[PDB]
Design a protein around this motif. Structure first.
Motif, mmCIF file in Angstrom:
data_model
loop_
_atom_site.group_PDB
_atom_site.id
_atom_site.type_symbol
_atom_site.label_atom_id
_atom_site.label_comp_id
_atom_site.label_asym_id
_atom_site.label_seq_id
_atom_site.Cartn_x
_atom_site.Cartn_y
_atom_site.Cartn_z
ATOM 1 N N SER A 1 0.859 -1.166 0.000
ATOM 2 C CA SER A 1 0.000 0.000 0.000
ATOM 3 C C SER A 1 0.910 1.235 0.000
ATOM 4 O O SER A 1 2.120 1.105 0.103
ATOM 5 C CB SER A 1 -0.873 -0.033 1.237
ATOM 6 O OG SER A 1 -1.523 -1.281 1.390
ATOM 7 N N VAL A 2 0.333 2.425 -0.134
ATOM 8 C CA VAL A 2 1.085 3.660 -0.177
ATOM 9 C C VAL A 2 1.503 4.060 1.236
ATOM 10 O O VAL A 2 0.699 4.058 2.179
ATOM 11 C CB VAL A 2 0.237 4.787 -0.790
ATOM 12 C CG1 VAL A 2 0.987 6.117 -0.748
ATOM 13 C CG2 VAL A 2 -0.154 4.515 -2.236
ATOM 14 N N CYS A 3 2.801 4.334 1.396
ATOM 15 C CA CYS A 3 3.359 4.695 2.666
ATOM 16 C C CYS A 3 2.958 6.101 3.083
ATOM 17 O O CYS A 3 2.366 6.816 2.306
ATOM 18 C CB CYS A 3 4.871 4.596 2.547
ATOM 19 S SG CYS A 3 5.791 4.373 4.097
ATOM 20 N N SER A 4 3.298 6.452 4.323
ATOM 21 C CA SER A 4 3.034 7.787 4.891
ATOM 22 C C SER A 4 4.167 8.115 5.839
ATOM 23 O O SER A 4 4.753 7.245 6.431
ATOM 24 C CB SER A 4 1.675 7.855 5.674
ATOM 25 O OG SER A 4 1.645 7.077 6.850
ATOM 26 N N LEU A 5 4.375 9.382 6.088
ATOM 27 C CA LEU A 5 5.370 9.807 7.071
ATOM 28 C C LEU A 5 4.990 9.397 8.451
ATOM 29 O O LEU A 5 5.816 8.914 9.228
ATOM 30 C CB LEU A 5 5.563 11.319 7.019
ATOM 31 C CG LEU A 5 6.616 11.881 7.960
ATOM 32 C CD1 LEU A 5 7.997 11.260 7.722
ATOM 33 C CD2 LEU A 5 6.652 13.366 7.825
ATOM 34 N N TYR A 6 3.705 9.516 8.764
ATOM 35 C CA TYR A 6 3.202 9.136 10.015
ATOM 36 C C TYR A 6 3.602 7.681 10.344
ATOM 37 O O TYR A 6 4.026 7.375 11.433
ATOM 38 C CB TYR A 6 1.671 9.315 9.999
ATOM 39 C CG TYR A 6 1.045 9.013 11.302
ATOM 40 C CD1 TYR A 6 0.889 7.678 11.743
ATOM 41 C CD2 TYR A 6 0.683 10.048 12.170
ATOM 42 C CE1 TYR A 6 0.360 7.391 12.935
ATOM 43 C CE2 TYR A 6 0.152 9.745 13.425
ATOM 44 C CZ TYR A 6 -0.005 8.402 13.781
ATOM 45 O OH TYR A 6 -0.543 8.052 14.980
ATOM 46 N N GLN A 7 3.372 6.803 9.377
ATOM 47 C CA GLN A 7 3.668 5.403 9.530
ATOM 48 C C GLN A 7 5.163 5.109 9.516
ATOM 49 O O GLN A 7 5.638 4.346 10.340
ATOM 50 C CB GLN A 7 2.974 4.576 8.481
ATOM 51 C CG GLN A 7 1.475 4.485 8.820
ATOM 52 C CD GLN A 7 0.753 3.560 7.942
ATOM 53 O OE1 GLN A 7 0.438 3.905 6.817
ATOM 54 N NE2 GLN A 7 0.530 2.349 8.424
ATOM 55 N N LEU A 8 5.873 5.769 8.626
ATOM 56 C CA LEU A 8 7.295 5.577 8.574
ATOM 57 C C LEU A 8 7.953 5.880 9.920
ATOM 58 O O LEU A 8 8.789 5.121 10.381
ATOM 59 C CB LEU A 8 7.866 6.439 7.474
ATOM 60 C CG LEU A 8 9.082 5.867 6.811
ATOM 61 C CD1 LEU A 8 8.860 4.409 6.351
ATOM 62 C CD2 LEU A 8 9.365 6.779 5.661
ATOM 63 N N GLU A 9 7.544 6.969 10.591
ATOM 64 C CA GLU A 9 8.108 7.397 11.855
ATOM 65 C C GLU A 9 7.804 6.470 13.022
ATOM 66 O O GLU A 9 8.541 6.467 13.995
ATOM 67 C CB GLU A 9 7.737 8.831 12.202
ATOM 68 C CG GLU A 9 8.465 9.826 11.437
ATOM 69 C CD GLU A 9 8.507 11.209 12.078
ATOM 70 O OE1 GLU A 9 7.540 11.603 12.707
ATOM 71 O OE2 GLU A 9 9.484 11.923 11.875
ATOM 72 N N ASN A 10 6.813 5.624 12.852
ATOM 73 C CA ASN A 10 6.598 4.591 13.848
ATOM 74 C C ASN A 10 7.673 3.550 13.922
ATOM 75 O O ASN A 10 7.700 2.763 14.869
ATOM 76 C CB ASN A 10 5.285 3.885 13.590
ATOM 77 C CG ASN A 10 4.090 4.681 14.052
ATOM 78 O OD1 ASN A 10 4.192 5.538 14.930
ATOM 79 N ND2 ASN A 10 3.027 4.441 13.426
ATOM 80 N N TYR A 11 8.568 3.544 12.931
ATOM 81 C CA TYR A 11 9.677 2.596 12.900
ATOM 82 C C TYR A 11 11.006 3.232 13.232
ATOM 83 O O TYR A 11 12.018 2.550 13.245
ATOM 84 C CB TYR A 11 9.710 1.900 11.558
ATOM 85 C CG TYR A 11 8.446 1.099 11.326
ATOM 86 C CD1 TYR A 11 8.279 -0.110 11.957
ATOM 87 C CD2 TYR A 11 7.417 1.600 10.572
ATOM 88 C CE1 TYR A 11 7.114 -0.816 11.821
ATOM 89 C CE2 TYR A 11 6.216 0.891 10.444
ATOM 90 C CZ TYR A 11 6.108 -0.330 11.065
ATOM 91 O OH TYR A 11 4.948 -1.098 10.951
#
Lengths: 30, 21, 30, 21
Positions: free
Chosen positions: B9-19
């Motif tokens: 699916s298409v990534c997001s900054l919000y999600q990326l920063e969770n890692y």
């Protein structure tokens, strides 16, 4: 660069740039 | 996990920063 | 590719290739 | 940590694999 499909080295590269000195975890099985 | 959210699916900054540590 | 000085994206890239489907953690502060 | 061992000094497979999940 973030708001797209990011796989493999492309994903790892986005994590590296976003997370900076924090570093990151790349857990593709989890 | 990250692959489902950012590769399949298409990534997001919000999600990326969770890692980030 | 592993037996050299590896920094930044170069290091991240080596981890990605070596670790494969395991993934990895990149902790530059730790 | 990894930077001292692999960036400031020459890395190794042995050491690199310590950071795999």
């Amino acid at each position: 660069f973030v708001n797209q499909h990011l796989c493999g080295s492309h994903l790892v590269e986005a994590l590296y740039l976003v997370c900076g000195e924090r570093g990151f975890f790349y857990t593709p099985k989890a | 996990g990250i692959v489902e959210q950012c590769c399949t699916s298409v990534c997001s900054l919000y999600q990326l920063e969770n890692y980030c540590n």
